[PDB]
Amino acid sequence: RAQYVNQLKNFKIRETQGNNGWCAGYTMSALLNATYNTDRYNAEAVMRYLHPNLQGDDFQFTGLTPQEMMKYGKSQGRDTQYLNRMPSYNEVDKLTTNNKDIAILGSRVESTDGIHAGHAMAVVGNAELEGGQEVIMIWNPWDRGFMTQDAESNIIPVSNGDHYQWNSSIYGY
Numbered sequence: 001r002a003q004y005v006n007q008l009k010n011f012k013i014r015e016t017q018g019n020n021g022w023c024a025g026y027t028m029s030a031l032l033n034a035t036y037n038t039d040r041y042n043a044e045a046v047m048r049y050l051h052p053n054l055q056g057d058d059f060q061f062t063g064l065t066p067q068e069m070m071k072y073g074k075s076q077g078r079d080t081q082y083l084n085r086m087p088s089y090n091e092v093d094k095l096t097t098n099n100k101d102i103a104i105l106g107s108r109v110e111s112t113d114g115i116h117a118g119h120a121m122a123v124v125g126n127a128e129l130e131g132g133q134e135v136i137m138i139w140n141p142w143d144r145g146f147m148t149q150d151a152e153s154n155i156i157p158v159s160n161g162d163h164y165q166w167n168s169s170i171y172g173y
Contacts, residue, residue, distance in 0.1 A: 007124050008099065023121070029043050080170050100173065109162070135149055
């Protein structure tokens with residue numbers, strides 16, 4: 001379907017997110033595993049590192065702030081940077097070529113509640129489909145595969161039917 005594909009060369013899906021709030025741990029572990037070419041990172045261990053004192057339900061379900069995500073990157077030797085938007089196709093291409101990882105900070109469009117839940121996902125790279133469409137490839141931690149995201153759209157339709165707006169990004173993992 002694509003005749004240009006640029007992906008982080010060692011990205012692999014090793015674990016998936018079930019009944020927990022560790023999406024940002026999933027995301028950062030997969031990115032850091034890809035860029036360092038390792039398997040030392042995993043969601044639970046990242047969350048334990050950032051939340052050493054939580055146990056029980058609080059440890060199971062408390063996620064990470066952007067600040068915590070940024071501090072984890074820096075702790076692991078990476079010059080991570082906040083981007084208060086979604087990158088362009090071009091920006092993903094360049095980052096990907098440079099073996100730098102991108103974390104997606106999104107929020108749910110749907111809301112029963114008036115609360116719009118936060119979610120973190122990983123960029124895997126970018127491609128040009130036959131016919132010219134520019135797409136960014138995304139790993140939602142829930143999933144055993146990748147989504148193809150129109151690079152002009154900042155709404156990500158996810159595998160349970162929900163929609164997440166790609167609000168911001170942390171690049172440089």
